[model samples]
Target: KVFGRCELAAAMKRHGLDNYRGYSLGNWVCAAKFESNFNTQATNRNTDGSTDYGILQINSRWWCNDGRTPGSRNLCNIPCSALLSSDITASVNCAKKIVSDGNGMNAWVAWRNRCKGTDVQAWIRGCRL
Candidate 1:
């Protein structure tokens, strides 16, 4: 894992996620926890013939190209593997771009299914960010 909750909260603050796209920091924090558990290298195969990459679980079908995956849109113009870096710069930038593109965090199913409408304080609990 690249971050414990506190460390991730600090990083998210540094990354300008204090209030991204008018959404609270807790939303992103909760999404990240449920998406990949802060594991930057995490990847998962979806039933839709797509793969989710990195901490935010960006989809290869739209956000990035896995190369091996056919018909990728690469909307973010980033290689899927780049999102796996521990630096998080690329991942954060891409995620913000995704939201600005009109999906909000709904682009991430984890956020839609798990973080939505749930009390998210625990995601940032004990973190002084």
Candidate 2:
């Protein structure tokens, strides 16, 4: 399912991501906006044969098992397809795992390059708190 800014923001709100590890919802908002345009089924293949799946573009090389990435960590212990579901619960939680594992938002370059150090309030601005 494709989500609008407010709709996507609402999903992340009750999912325990807001202010997660000092990265506010704005970071997530901005990341998703650029990463997948809120497209739940979005997928990108890396030159290394790894795949980035779902809204946050979780990588198969380290997070999910896609059977194509070489010696993947599969850290989330889930199939990469799980991240493509519209429920979003899986990918959202996996995103948390991405951070909790002690890395920053750089896990998704969209956040590091586009969302970081920017005023992201407008990214999620239309959402009702």
Candidate 3:
């Protein structure tokens, strides 16, 4: 049930891409496609239209609004560096920090459960930090 895909491995092929080793462009792109549509520049709105953010469809008004990291306030549209921290397993760890208090894999599991049922897409189950 764990997957070892080329996306993360090949990412290291780049001079600086290894900074994001524990993370995966494939998983990120997959999560994006599953959550949004891989649109690195998208903004979603709730019924009130007050909650919206970029890329990963982050709800800025609700999540990661801590006034600490000015850029982190926008949860989804995070900088590439944030995803590729020097710390190997930083991205998912950072993701946990952003959502305030949501169960980490609860969201991903929902995706895996729904996604595994279908063959239309490749579900990289083992791809995690």
Q: Which candidate leads the pack in lDDT? A: 2
lDDT of 1 by residue, 1-129 (tens): 577877877888899987889778889889999999989999999887889988889889988988877876998898999999988888898898898988788877888999989987678887876
**All candidates' lDDT scores?**
0.86, 0.89, 0.40
What TM-score, computed on C-alpha atoms, does each candidate reach?
0.92, 0.95, 0.41
**Candidate that scores best on TM-score:** 2
Model 2 weakest 10-residue run by lDDT? 101-110
Candidate 3 runs further than 4 Å off: 1-28, 64-94, 107-113, 116-129
User: Clashing pairs in model 2?
Assistant: none
What tens digits encode model 3's per-residue C-alpha lDDT throughout 20-104? 4343334443544555443334445456444333334445444434233334444444443343233323344444454335443
The lDDT, on a scale of 0 to 1, for candidate 3 is 0.40
Q: How accurate locally is residue 10 in candidate 2, as Cα lDDT from 0 to 100?
A: 85
| Candidate 1 displacement at residue 40 in angstroms | 0.7
lDDT, residue 22, candidate 2: 89
**What local lDDT score does residue 99 receive in model 1, on the 0 to 100 scale?**
88
Considering TM-score, which of the candidate structures 2 and 3 is the better prediction for this target? 2
